[PDB]
Amino acid sequence: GYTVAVVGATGAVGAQMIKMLEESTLPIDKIRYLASARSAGKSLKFKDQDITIEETTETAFEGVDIALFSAGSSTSAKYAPYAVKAGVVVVDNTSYFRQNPDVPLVVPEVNAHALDAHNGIIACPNCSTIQMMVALEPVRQKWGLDRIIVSTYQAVSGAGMGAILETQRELREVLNDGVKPCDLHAEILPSGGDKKHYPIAFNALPQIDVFTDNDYTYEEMKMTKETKKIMEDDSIAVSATCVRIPVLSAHSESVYIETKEVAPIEEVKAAIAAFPGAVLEDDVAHQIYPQAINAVGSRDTFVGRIRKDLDAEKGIHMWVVSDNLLKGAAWNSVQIAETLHERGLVRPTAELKFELK
Amino acid sequence: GYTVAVVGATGAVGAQMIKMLEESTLPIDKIRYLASARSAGKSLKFKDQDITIEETTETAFEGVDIALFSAGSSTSAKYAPYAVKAGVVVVDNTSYFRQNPDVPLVVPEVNAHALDAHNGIIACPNCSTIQMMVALEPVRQKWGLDRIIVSTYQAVSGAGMGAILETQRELREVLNDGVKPCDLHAEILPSGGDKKHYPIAFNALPQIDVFTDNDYTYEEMKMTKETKKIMEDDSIAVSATCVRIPVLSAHSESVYIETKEVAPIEEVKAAIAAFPGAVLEDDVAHQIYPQAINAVGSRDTFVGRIRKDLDAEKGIHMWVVSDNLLKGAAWNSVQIAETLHERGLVR
Amino acid sequence: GYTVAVVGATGAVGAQMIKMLEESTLPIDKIRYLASARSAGKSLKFKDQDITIEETTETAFEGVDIALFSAGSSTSAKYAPYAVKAGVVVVDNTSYFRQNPDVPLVVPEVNAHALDAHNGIIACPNCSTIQMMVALEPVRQKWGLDRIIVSTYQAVSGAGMGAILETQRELREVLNDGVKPCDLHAEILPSGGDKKHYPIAFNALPQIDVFTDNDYTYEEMKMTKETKKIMEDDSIAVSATCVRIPVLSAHSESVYIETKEVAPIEEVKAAIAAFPGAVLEDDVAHQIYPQAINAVGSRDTFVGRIRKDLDAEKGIHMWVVSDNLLKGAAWNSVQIAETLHERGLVRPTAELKFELK
Amino acid sequence: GYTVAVVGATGAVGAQMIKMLEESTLPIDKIRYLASARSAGKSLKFKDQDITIEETTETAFEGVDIALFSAGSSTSAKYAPYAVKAGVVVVDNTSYFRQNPDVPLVVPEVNAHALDAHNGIIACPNCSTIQMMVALEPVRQKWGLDRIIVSTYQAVSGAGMGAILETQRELREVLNDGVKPCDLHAEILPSGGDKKHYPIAFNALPQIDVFTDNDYTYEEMKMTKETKKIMEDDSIAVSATCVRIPVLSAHSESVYIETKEVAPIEEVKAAIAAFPGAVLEDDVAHQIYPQAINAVGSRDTFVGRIRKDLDAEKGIHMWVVSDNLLKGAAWNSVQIAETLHERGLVRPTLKFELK
Numbered sequence A, C: 001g002y003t004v005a006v007v008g009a010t011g012a013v014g015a016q017m018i019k020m021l022e023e024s025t026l027p028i029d030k031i032r033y034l035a036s037a038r039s040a041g042k043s044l045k046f047k048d049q050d051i052t053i054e055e056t057t058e059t060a061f062e063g064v065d066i067a068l069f070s071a072g073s074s075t076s077a078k079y080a081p082y083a084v085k086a087g088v089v090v091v092d093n094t095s096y097f098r099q100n101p102d103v104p105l106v107v108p109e110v111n112a113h114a115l116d117a118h119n120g121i122i123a124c125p126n127c128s129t130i131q132m133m134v135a136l137e138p139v140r141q142k143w144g145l146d147r148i149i150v151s152t153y154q155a156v157s158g159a160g161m162g163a164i165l166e167t168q169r170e171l172r173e174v175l176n177d178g179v180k181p182c183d184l185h186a187e188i189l190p191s192g193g194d195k196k197h198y199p200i201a202f203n204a205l206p207q208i209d210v211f212t213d214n215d216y217t218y219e220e221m222k223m224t225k226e227t228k229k230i231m232e233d234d235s236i237a238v239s240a241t242c243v244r245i246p247v248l249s250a251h252s253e254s255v256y257i258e259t260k261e262v263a264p265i266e267e268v269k270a271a272i273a274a275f276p277g278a279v280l281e282d283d284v285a286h287q288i289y290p291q292a293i294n295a296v297g298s299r300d301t302f303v304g305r306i307r308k309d310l311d312a313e314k315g316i317h318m319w320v321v322s323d324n325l326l327k328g329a330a331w332n333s334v335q336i337a338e339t340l341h342e343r344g345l346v347r348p349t350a351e352l353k354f355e356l357k
Numbered sequence B: 001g002y003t004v005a006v007v008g009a010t011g012a013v014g015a016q017m018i019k020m021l022e023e024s025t026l027p028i029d030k031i032r033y034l035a036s037a038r039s040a041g042k043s044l045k046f047k048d049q050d051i052t053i054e055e056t057t058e059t060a061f062e063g064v065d066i067a068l069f070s071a072g073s074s075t076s077a078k079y080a081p082y083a084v085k086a087g088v089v090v091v092d093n094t095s096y097f098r099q100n101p102d103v104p105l106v107v108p109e110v111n112a113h114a115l116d117a118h119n120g121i122i123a124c125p126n127c128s129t130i131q132m133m134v135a136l137e138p139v140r141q142k143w144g145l146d147r148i149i150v151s152t153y154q155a156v157s158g159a160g161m162g163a164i165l166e167t168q169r170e171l172r173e174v175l176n177d178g179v180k181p182c183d184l185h186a187e188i189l190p191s192g193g194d195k196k197h198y199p200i201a202f203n204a205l206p207q208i209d210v211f212t213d214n215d216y217t218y219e220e221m222k223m224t225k226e227t228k229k230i231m232e233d234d235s236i237a238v239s240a241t242c243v244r245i246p247v248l249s250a251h252s253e254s255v256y257i258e259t260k261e262v263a264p265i266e267e268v269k270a271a272i273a274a275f276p277g278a279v280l281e282d283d284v285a286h287q288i289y290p291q292a293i294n295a296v297g298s299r300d301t302f303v304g305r306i307r308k309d310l311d312a313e314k315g316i317h318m319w320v321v322s323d324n325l326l327k328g329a330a331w332n333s334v335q336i337a338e339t340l341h342e343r344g345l346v347r
Numbered sequence D: 001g002y003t004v005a006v007v008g009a010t011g012a013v014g015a016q017m018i019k020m021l022e023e024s025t026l027p028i029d030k031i032r033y034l035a036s037a038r039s040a041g042k043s044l045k046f047k048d049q050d051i052t053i054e055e056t057t058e059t060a061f062e063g064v065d066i067a068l069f070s071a072g073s074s075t076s077a078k079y080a081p082y083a084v085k086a087g088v089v090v091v092d093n094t095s096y097f098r099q100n101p102d103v104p105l106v107v108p109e110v111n112a113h114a115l116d117a118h119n120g121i122i123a124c125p126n127c128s129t130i131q132m133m134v135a136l137e138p139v140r141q142k143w144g145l146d147r148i149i150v151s152t153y154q155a156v157s158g159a160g161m162g163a164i165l166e167t168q169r170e171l172r173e174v175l176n177d178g179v180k181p182c183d184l185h186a187e188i189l190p191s192g193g194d195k196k197h198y199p200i201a202f203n204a205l206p207q208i209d210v211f212t213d214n215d216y217t218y219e220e221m222k223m224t225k226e227t228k229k230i231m232e233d234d235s236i237a238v239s240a241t242c243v244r245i246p247v248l249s250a251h252s253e254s255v256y257i258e259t260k261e262v263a264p265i266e267e268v269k270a271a272i273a274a275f276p277g278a279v280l281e282d283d284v285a286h287q288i289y290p291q292a293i294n295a296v297g298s299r300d301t302f303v304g305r306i307r308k309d310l311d312a313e314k315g316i317h318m319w320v321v322s323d324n325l326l327k328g329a330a331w332n333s334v335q336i337a338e339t340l341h342e343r344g345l346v347r348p349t350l351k352f353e354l355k
């Protein structure tokens, strides 16, 4: 089978990428771990095999059949076009190539068909978008979607290994040393690139990624724009509010929709339940609903609290939870890689459509 | 038959060189694709056969009969001498050998005769100049040429594959992300070699290549000098303004000429139509004139908007369009290759 | 103060007429917006104030001091003579009246004295012509002008809002939906009212306006004849080739001239630099020259690439760029209006010189 | 007059801080020498008077008017906020507060005016930066400054007293015992806190301080950032290479600039000569140029090798030399204190957290 490279092997997503590949249906002959200079030379396991980490360079992709990128937009912007030139099929986790019409933006259970026409890079959508698409696609299939209003409850792991560590030490300082939450010193959250940083311990930060010109943040607009693209329908109205909360792993979403035809609630539960990747967890009589802590370690997307709006005939509320590192990232990526292998789509692209620097 | 080498087969001209060879009257026994170390190993089709890209090296040219260079004047300056020594005939599609008196500069329809005295290197002319020569030769032949004034509307594909991709994503950022054109970041155009780069998205850049000592660019000076050499007449006045526009493929030219004798338009139209490589597309009553999007894919040079100057007795304006990767490059080069074979000049 | 009417307020030019008036030296007591029945009854902003759009009719001009017209030649032909009978002073943007010797054809920096004999209508010249006049008058003043040869690179905004939208949609269709440029369906360009329409995305269309009996189009003949009228010199030989290119706003011109006496290039640059409305952008050492994207939003006309012909003693080449919506149309009209005000020329005309249709 | 405290009185800069204060115009009623616990109790002289060194504590700044901190970033990090709370005006010779917008970064000849908005802490810039600013400001004033390229030739004194003694013993090991320079053992240079140490004896080490994420060192990036701050212009292009050479004292710089307009050399020379704090030492006919060994003990910045670039219209080369312990540190810091006194700015101010 394949030589498979993981770019960003030492990170939060990369650790999970390693785990998803170890259990993958993909024929792997050789596995390669790529990071920056700081991890080069260091060792990391694949099953029992002992794998030395390689520095990522323009010439690192010779002999590689598939590369999963999860090292940040800059790394992908820099080294993915070279991997393509080399003959790799790239599955990128970052947001860099997502809006490029030459690049499929794929959730396998929803739009696997878009993989066929790939040009050597396939993008794994934003994590909050992925779980929402899993939850919503069986609903659109039957009754259509007019609009989505979403408020998200995002875990810190989506911002990376340092974010996780920053949160754990902040909480430890409050709970163990008696420090007040607003006397904490943050270096990373709400966004690593932005000017100011704020404590997350016992907080809810209504900022993920930086702000755009319309006063929505980038995370908020990614949900809007990625939704329209994955679902292939620009007429679906989408607005989002994305909040960081003190959760390590698993994103949660309060999702409001309006359908095009009225959609009886028990039929909505049945539709979601019967969609691949989606698990109905909805039994309010035994207080059953999706929970972040129960979603961690699972590849499934969990859906509950499903109930019609109190006023809008065609309006429905729900609660959607998934592990942001698995379905939101690594599992979706490994699922994409497996689907490409299955459909004969793991080969070089003759025509190069991504400029180099 | 022949062992043919395509040097720079992965770029914009290279891709079309493959296409033109696939369809040529050249007897090709063996074909080789040469490029940089970054392309070595990778595979490209010649018809149904898979061909593995080799690195351009010193001893790559052993056993090659013909080499078509389309890989940067730098690469022609380095390797063409070794190719020639290895006993190759080189058709160079770069600007390096263009003002060497020992190197013919050839448009087969205009100055085929110049090939007879070749010393192993034949230079394919500048694209903008090629199409102007095809259009103008049948006019010179009959009424002479005193002067040419030309303004060009040049497609981004002339500056390479990466200019294409720069142009497409710039456009996408304006249309898709709502970016202001003056707020875009450019890395290639107007010219890779120059210090500053400017957006081409929704713009017109009056710079192709770098500036010369006299405030005309190298592109403008080529059209002047290469017109004199190809037509073997230094007495023809040629002055040019070269502009990059957001067209992906095909160059367009607003051409102004003064002939030595009054050329009636009906006859000028007829001389162009009859000239090989030139197609008359001129019927203003049904809005017929050459268009850049119509010329892509075609080996012909299309001429129209032909009309007399409103005041100068011997003045004529026209619109000349041609695919810059084809007749302006790969096709002219392959046509040179085919003529060399037919004249027995490949040895 | 004046009552000021903008006819065709809803269009590309009308919209900039609004911008220019908000920033104008004109004493404005009342602003009115007029358009067709399509838009009559809708609303639009003048500064922070809501203005109801009115239908343009024969009786719609009572009380108006100055009326700016930018609504097509037919709307000018039908309603400008009625505004003049009402006592209005008309600044027309269209081609309809430009060649009537009773109508001044004015670029304020060049021939403002022609405004004194006005008879109620003052014509704003063709946009391509305006910019060329700003560039060339300083030259003519010192060394004379024997001939002009011009090739234009014209932006689609010149052909109106619909053309702008056509151009945007075709480009999106090619870049996003993988449509070949020849398989695109045009409806407006090159010429709204001509028999066939062609795509403009990645094209250069050597037609602007319909063709005339001599095989030049009207756009090309406008440049020829408006030049002669504006400069008041029928002996200047002018030929134009006018092309539409995929640019939203700002026209660019490759301009060749032959002067009467030899004009030294360093002196030519200084004469152009010192002319009002004209800005020298000429430093090839640093790749400085006029660019359409930089001229958008500016009321200045930009001149560079200035260089003598390689063979013709008195031949000079240059590159002229201006916003066709501003100096080419709206700003020129507002400048005319402001100068009419300055010279006490805003008042009714006794004797009616334009036919009522 | 003032109660002045010198914090880090026993180091290389601290020792020149004493010399500069003795000859200062600052009125001094009382002086205090502060350092760590291992210096406490020992004595140093101020003029012909003996002074007992005290431990630098979070409370020791009661009654002090002016404090000159030359004891490392973490000492200024710890105790300068407490000094400020205590009503002292601090002149900080270290790099801690340098890019803090509430802290003016001052070379008095260039941007004395920035002193007026101080919040109790004034930062003395990097030594390489100071001399470069003295030499270039008079050119900027007249013909503008577009870009700077600099390669430095830096003395070991810049890395503190231990660096001097390391350099000395390494050289004696080579010269007296015949030790291969590449066989020498080093513990401080190129940078003490970094992992690996290298001999400086008969060497040129292209590393000063630790490396940053852009592969330039912090020293190099100090010159870049601090040039922008001092001249209050982010548009000036600055790129540096900082090198340690076997010189005990005085930094030297090869300096390339491109101005905004053409700056005649005879005029450039005249401008530098007339500029306070800068001496023109430039007579190639008699081989006169700034020299490191001539510069030691002097408060002036010496400039020579002034000549136009062989190609670039607006390019100029020059050689700048100054004592890095004087104008590069202790003199600059006493010049700030004097200017603060002259301007009536020595008074109690509160924008820095207490650790």
Ligand SMILES: NC(=O)c1ccc[n+]([C@@H]2O[C@H](COP(=O)([O-])OP(=O)(O)OC[C@H]3O[C@@H](n4cnc5c(N)ncnc54)[C@H](OP(=O)(O)O)[C@@H]3O)[C@@H](O)[C@H]2O)c1
Pocket (backbone or CB within 6 Å): A007, A008, A009, A010, A011, A012, A013, A014, A034, A035, A036, A037, A038, A039, A040, A056, A070, A071, A072, A073, A075, A093, A094, A095, A125, A126, A127, A157, A158, A159, A160, A161, A162, A324, A325, A328, A329
């Ligand atoms: N977190 C999620 O749930 C999630 C979901 C979907 C998409 N993503 C995207 O995945 C990207 C990063 O993943 P993360 O959040 O897991 O970050 P992270 O935990 O900080 O991990 C960063 C990884 O990037 C590598 N890296 C950094 N610079 C590099 C370089 N120059 N060359 C090669 N590798 C480099 C690091 O390697 P070293 O060991 O050398 O530092 C490390 O392996 C982001 O763009 C994010 O938007 C994340």
Ligand SMILES: NC(=O)c1ccc[n+]([C@@H]2O[C@H](COP(=O)([O-])OP(=O)(O)OC[C@H]3O[C@@H](n4cnc5c(N)ncnc54)[C@H](OP(=O)(O)O)[C@@H]3O)[C@@H](O)[C@H]2O)c1
Pocket (backbone or CB within 6 Å): B007, B008, B009, B010, B011, B012, B013, B014, B034, B035, B036, B037, B038, B039, B040, B056, B070, B071, B072, B073, B075, B093, B094, B095, B125, B126, B127, B157, B158, B159, B160, B161, B162, B324, B325, B328, B329
């Ligand atoms: N474009 C036109 O219409 C046109 C017309 C007339 C003349 N030309 C001239 O023809 C040349 C290239 O044409 P293009 O537009 O096709 O350029 P392009 O798309 O940028 O491609 C350049 C080609 O040159 C090869 N190459 C570059 N450097 C090389 C090296 N050091 N060693 C070996 N091969 C190297 C590249 O190989 P890799 O892929 O491995 O890098 C690639 O195949 C230029 O000199 C251009 O000015 C172009």
Ligand SMILES: NC(=O)c1ccc[n+]([C@@H]2O[C@H](COP(=O)([O-])OP(=O)(O)OC[C@H]3O[C@@H](n4cnc5c(N)ncnc54)[C@H](OP(=O)(O)O)[C@@H]3O)[C@@H](O)[C@H]2O)c1
Pocket (backbone or CB within 6 Å): C007, C008, C009, C010, C011, C012, C013, C014, C034, C035, C036, C037, C038, C039, C040, C056, C069, C070, C071, C072, C073, C075, C093, C094, C095, C125, C126, C127, C157, C158, C159, C160, C161, C162, C324, C325, C328, C329, C330
């Ligand atoms: N485009 C340029 O650069 C430029 C430059 C100088 C002069 N001009 C002249 O300005 C005129 C049109 O401006 P544009 O190019 O900006 O066109 P546009 O965007 O298509 O809009 C045309 C305007 O004309 C109005 N209109 C159409 N029919 C009308 C009628 N029967 N009665 C009243 N108003 C009517 C439209 O109003 P509704 O919204 O009610 O349909 C709209 O306000 C043309 O004559 C053009 O030559 C244009």
Ligand SMILES: NC(=O)c1ccc[n+]([C@@H]2O[C@H](COP(=O)([O-])OP(=O)(O)OC[C@H]3O[C@@H](n4cnc5c(N)ncnc54)[C@H](OP(=O)(O)O)[C@@H]3O)[C@@H](O)[C@H]2O)c1
Pocket (backbone or CB within 6 Å): D007, D008, D009, D010, D011, D012, D013, D014, D034, D035, D036, D037, D038, D039, D040, D056, D069, D070, D071, D072, D073, D075, D093, D094, D095, D127, D157, D158, D159, D160, D161, D162, D324, D325, D328, D329
């Ligand atoms: N060294 C230079 O050439 C130079 C040049 C320009 C700017 N600077 C800045 O000034 C600082 C050091 O310069 P230097 O020449 O004085 O270095 P040095 O000769 O190594 O001496 C360091 C001084 O800091 C004092 N110190 C260290 N730890 C202390 C603590 N915990 N509490 C109180 N005092 C402490 C030392 O006191 P003890 O005697 O008790 O150890 C000593 O007086 C550095 O931060 C540097 O950035 C230095």
Ligand SMILES: *C(=O)C[C@@H](N)C(=O)O
Pocket (backbone or CB within 6 Å): A125, A126, A127, A128, A154, A155, A158, A159, A208, A209, A219, A324, A328
């Ligand atoms: C999912 O893509 C993770 C990231 N968007 C975040 O939560 O910050």
Ligand SMILES: *C(=O)C[C@@H](N)C(=O)O
Pocket (backbone or CB within 6 Å): B125, B126, B127, B128, B154, B155, B157, B158, B159, B208, B209, B219, B324, B328
């Ligand atoms: C024609 O030869 C292509 C190239 N000269 C260009 O367009 O710049």
Ligand SMILES: *C(=O)C[C@@H](N)C(=O)O
Pocket (backbone or CB within 6 Å): C125, C126, C127, C128, C154, C155, C157, C158, C159, C208, C209, C219, C324, C328
């Ligand atoms: C200027 O008047 C605009 C219009 N004539 C055009 O560009 O077509």
Ligand SMILES: *C(=O)C[C@@H](N)C(=O)O
Pocket (backbone or CB within 6 Å): D125, D126, D127, D128, D154, D155, D157, D158, D159, D208, D209, D219, D324, D328
């Ligand atoms: C001056 O600031 C001294 C120090 N920067 C050094 O030489 O390292």
